Amino acid sequence: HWGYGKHNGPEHWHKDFPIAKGERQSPVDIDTHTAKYDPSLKPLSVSYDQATSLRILNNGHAFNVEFDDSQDKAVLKGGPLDGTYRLIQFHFHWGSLDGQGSEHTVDKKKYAAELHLVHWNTKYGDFGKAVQQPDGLAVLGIFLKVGSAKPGLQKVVDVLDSIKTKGKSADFTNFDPRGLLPESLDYWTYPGSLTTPPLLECVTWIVLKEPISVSSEQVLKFRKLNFNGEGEPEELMVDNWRPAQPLKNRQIKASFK
Ligand SMILES: NS(=O)(=O)[C@@H]1O[C@H](CO)[C@H](O)[C@H](O)[C@H]1O
Ligand SMILES: [Zn+2]
Numbered sequence: 001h002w003g004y005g006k007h008n009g010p011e012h013w014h015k016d017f018p019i020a021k022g023e024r025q026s027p028v029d030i031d032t033h034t035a036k037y038d039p040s041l042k043p044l045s046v047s048y049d050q051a052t053s054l055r056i057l058n059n060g061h062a063f064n065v066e067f068d069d070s071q072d073k074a075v076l077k078g079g080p081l082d083g084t085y086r087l088i089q090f091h092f093h094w095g096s097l098d099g100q101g102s103e104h105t106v107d108k109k110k111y112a113a114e115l116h117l118v119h120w121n122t123k124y125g126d127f128g129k130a131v132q133q134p135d136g137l138a139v140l141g142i143f144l145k146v147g148s149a150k151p152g153l154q155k156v157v158d159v160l161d162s163i164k165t166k167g168k169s170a171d172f173t174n175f176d177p178r179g180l181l182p183e184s185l186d187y188w189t190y191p192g193s194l195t196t197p198p199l200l201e202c203v204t205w206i207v208l209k210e211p212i213s214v215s216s217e218q219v220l221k222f223r224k225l226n227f228n229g230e231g232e233p234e235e236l237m238v239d240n241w242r243p244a245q246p247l248k249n250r251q252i253k254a255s256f257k
Contacts, residue, residue: 002197003061003227010242017197024201025245026192027103030252035188038253044185044206045078046140046178051087053175056159060166060227061196062091062240065156065175069120069127074177076119076138079206079255080189085119085138088127090177092116093195094222096238098146103195103241104207106143111211112219113144114241115180116195134191136202142182143211150214152179157221166229182210186256195242209256 002008002016014020051074056065066089067074074087094113095101102111117140120130130136144150155175162170186209193201225237
């Protein structure tokens with residue numbers, strides 16, 4: 001099926017998912033000199049105090065840390081968002097080298113990796129219904145650069161050995177996502193889509209200006225994961241990022257000057 005290889009990568013997705021060449025695809029390059037400061041934007045509210053993590057799974061494309069989204073425990077509000085969005089999972093996109101890995105770029109600059117915290121609009125009842133709506137999801141994107149270690153990320157790094165291959169999952173309770181956030185919540189925002197098939201155009205992207213730092217050792221452990229399932233030939237899980245797409249008829253707004 002779809003993947004990130006030469007024969008099933010991003011360049012091939014449009015054949016099975018024509019929306020890949022749609023009007024509001026992601027990711028995009030954020031040209032800081034074209035983004036418009038919007039003083040009308042409300043303060044961004046990240047309420048992850050009651051976040052309830054459940055499990056970590058290797059899905060063959062990346063690994064997802066899933067949360068219990070049966071109640072308004074961990075939510076995202078404010079900013080360009082109207083209503084309440086519940087956190088359902090987070091995952092990363094990374095490269096084979098430190099100079100690549102992020103999906104969004106800033107003035108064409110690529111970061112080593114990108115964290116995506118996925119939330120769905122509660123007004124729609126469930127995730128499945130939400131992805132069918134133009135304002136169904138809100139994804140918080142955080143860039144990762146190689147430098148000092150990120151304490152809040154080490155817990156995730158410590159369990160990767162237990163989910164090396166596709167299909168593997170491990171218990172991952174009591175994890176605090178607040179430990180993955182940078183100091184500043186300044187951001188850019190624009191209407192976009194999921195960056196992996198089905199590429200649905202249901203996402204309000206909120207990309208933070210300030211990247212978080214992770215150690216070389218931490219990123220290396222991400223690169224030890226496998227795209228393949230147990231027993232199959234090894235294919236290192238690296239470069240699971242989609243390149244920037246045309247901005248077309250869209251404007252990127254900034255929460256800061
Ligand atoms: N990369 S992405 O747009 O957040 C994409 O979203 C999908 C729907 O939530 C799934 O979570 C994919 O795992 C994720 O990569
Ligand atoms: Zn993602």
